Amino acid sequence: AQLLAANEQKFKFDPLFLRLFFRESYPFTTEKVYLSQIPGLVNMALYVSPIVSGEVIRSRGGSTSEFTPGYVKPKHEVNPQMTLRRLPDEDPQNLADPAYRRRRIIMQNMRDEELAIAQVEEMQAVSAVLKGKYTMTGEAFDPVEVDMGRSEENNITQSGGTEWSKRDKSTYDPTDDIEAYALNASGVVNIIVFDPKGWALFRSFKAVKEKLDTRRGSNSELETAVKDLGKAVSYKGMYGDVAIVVYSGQYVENGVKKNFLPDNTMVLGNTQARGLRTYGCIQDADAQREGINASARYPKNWVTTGDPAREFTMIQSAPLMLLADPDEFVSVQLA
């Protein structure tokens, strides 16, 4: 059992979703998300006559304001019985210390913990901006469908009508489809991040390959983001006007591993779409009596006396991240 302050990572490397589209964090002192409580977009046009001023403007009463945040509280043991991750030859005598082994093993345990919540949050993000629906579900828990409201024109499919696979691999240009799906996106699209084989049949067209610019032509901080997360986001290059990226991230589930992304999917939208990170109550007596009922995360190291007389690291959170405008992204399944 070590203090709360032993929670230093400086490792925030989420794959460009919770850090770039979903910056809009709202931890609450209350259980649910109350979209009426969030101001979101403000009623933002009307003025008043040059004699007096008008009424009082409020948070404009969101129609649906009741969903259950994913209160996730996992834990692990940091029992000093293992040989640990030994960074090359930094004096294993301190590993021989139970104190250093226990502290850096709580380091390792907790980092596994937040990357676990981060990967489940990224699955929530990919569900969110791929269908507008999120499955708040788990065993011994009712499945609540949390819908931002993704429209039908945001779910139009490439296989409908003519498929890119069922097209000329040399002369056909899918740019026409690119603006066709981008027009009904309530904004400009500046990233065309694909799943791998989706980008494969996208680039199979020649027009794509002599239309794209392999050069840097550094447009924004997206190159810096790729250099940071050189793991699963791949900056293919410029398609001229728009940036071409491929995400091949993978989640390692209970017995097997598989990619986050489905077979062939796309979301057309902006890099500055508004993403909410509403956070529920944290059900920990420590959190309430020290005021961490409204926060992002909560770690603790703590000893059980009695039957499971041991010591554990416990991580608690409650995210219900969504997208403010589901119509911002057009979600297309590809050929």
Partner: protein, 474 residues
């Protein structure tokens, strides 16, 4: 309440070092938010050092075979040199170039009071404005951690590298953190040079063997923190609820079965009854103007009121609680509150002089315990530099060399705050008894009076001769 503050059951050193940062941080919090620490450090300053800290060099003339007169003249030379070197008006005796000897002693004693330790370093200044190229830079206690903030180890323990026997070899000084964005890098610093040179003066009071750090404050001050909080909040609640008043409206109405039947009929299909009654009551309050004072009675249609029945109404007792606990921790921490916040309640004559003399002797204790170390260390370094520069001449008949008998040659004592005044009659009857019976010497007389016998005699010579010349009465 024991939850937010937790003592382990172990030796004090291993019970404090693991929670060193938290205890010291909350100590910083209370010494910054609270005036008691400022008053305590100020009184400790004014009782230990006071105006100044005076050097007196007494080489062991009897043991070294040195003549007492030669020792006294050599002491005169070294005292003149030391006073003129210490009186530098440009604050130039520190590497920071902003503290004289007075604030050397000030910061040293303050930090040895707070953390229990003080860290001085004898560095070689290059500024040629003075004859002596040695300055003394004080080193923060945050600097002493294991190389790169690693936890305690076999022999590298909280920043000090020692042997199995505990002998303090050296230290790992982390880089300064001001501005709040410098990284820390740990540098090796030995405690002392092999030739006896005092390079890193590490003066701390160890409560037990093997202890590396001094004493705290917060680990006995959390209770003032939470008593001040609780008295503060309870006075706020008492003040706000002496005349809290509920202004509602009730009526006769309330025909039991009829009212219940009307409410049930309204719930089912007859809400028009409730709407009509609400309209009648709104017209009631708008035709009455139901107003109590300068303010409007908050709108309450009949049949609902607050029940502000209270809890027990005995005296809070906080009066004698707080007197007992202030008493308690006052001659806990050591300096009495009848001056740490100055009560004059029922205090008497024996009260005053007994409390004053015991407290002053006890400050003499703390002074001789936590000031003479720094004084002797600094004096030894300065005297070594003076011998290097041949400023003062060592006795020719030196039985032992300077380097061999630095302790014998550099034997010194120091004088703290000035002449104590408490009663007057007390000190004067003591003085007359001592001067008539001869029960006071030069050294302890000057210790009691904060003066010097040589200068009092020379100035009495001057007094008598000027009175004779000008016509006054010697």
């Amino acid at each position: 309440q024991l939850r937010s503050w937790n003592p382990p059951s172990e030796s004090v050193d291993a019970a404090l070092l693991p929670n060193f940062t938290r205890g010291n941080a909350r100590a910083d919090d209370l010494v910054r938010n609270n005036g008691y620490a400022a008053n305590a450090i100020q009184l400790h300053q004014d009782h230990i050092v006071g105006s100044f800290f005076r050097l007196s060099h007494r080489p062991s003339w009897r043991y070294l075979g040195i003549g007492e007169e030669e020792a006294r003249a050599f002491s005169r030379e070294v005292e003149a040199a030391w006073k003129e070197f210490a009186e530098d008006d440009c604050c130039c005796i520190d590497v920071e170039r902003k503290r004289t000897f007075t604030m050397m002693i000030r910061e040293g004693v303050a930090m040895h009071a707070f953390n229990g330790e003080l860290f001085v370093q004898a560095t070689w200044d290059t500024s040629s404005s003075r004859l002596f190229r040695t300055q003394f830079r004080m080193v923060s206690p945050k600097r002493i951690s294991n190389p790169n903030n690693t936890g305690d180890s076999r022999n590298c323990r909280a920043g000090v590298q020692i042997n199995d026997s505990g002998a303090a070899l050296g230290y790992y000084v982390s880089e300064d953190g001001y501005p709040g964005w410098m990284p820390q890098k740990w540098t090796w610093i030995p405690r002392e040079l092999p030739g006896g040179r005092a390079s890193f003066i590490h003066v701390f009071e160890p409560v037990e063997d093997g202890q590396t750090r001094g004493a705290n404050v917060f680990y006995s001050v959390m209770e003032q923190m939470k008593m001040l909080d609780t008295l503060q909040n309870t006075q706020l609640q008492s003040a706000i609820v002496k005349a809290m008043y509920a202004a509602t409206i009730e009526s006769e109405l309330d025909t039991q079965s009829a009212m219940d039947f009307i409410l049930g009929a309204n719930s089912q299909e007859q809400r028009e009854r409730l709407t009509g009654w609400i309209g009648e009551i709104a017209a009631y309050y708008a035709a009455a103007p139901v107003r109590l004072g300068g303010a409007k009675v908050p709108h309450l249609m009949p049949g609902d009121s607050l029940n502000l029945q209270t809890a027990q109404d005995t005296d809070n007792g906080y009066s004698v609680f707080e007197q007992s606990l202030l008493r308690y921790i006052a001659a806990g921490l050591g300096v009495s509150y009848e001056q740490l916040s100055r009560n004059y309640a029922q205090m008497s004559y024996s009260t005053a002089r007994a409390s004053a003399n015991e407290s002053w002797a006890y400050f003499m204790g703390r002074r001789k315990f936590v000031a003479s170390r720094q004084a002797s260390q600094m004096f030894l370094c300065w005297l070594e530099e003076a011998i290097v520069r041949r400023v003062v001449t060592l006795p020719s008949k030196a039985r032992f060399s300077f380097q061999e008998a630095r302790s014998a040659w550099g034997n010194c004592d120091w004088i703290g705050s000035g002449r104590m005044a408490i009663d007057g009659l007390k000190e004067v009857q003591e003085a007359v008894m001592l001067i008539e019976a001869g029960l006071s010497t030069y050294e302890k007389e000057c210790a009691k009076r904060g003066d010097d016998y040589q200068e009092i005699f020379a100035q009495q010579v001057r007094e008598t001769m000027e009175r004779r010349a000008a016509g006054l009465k010697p």
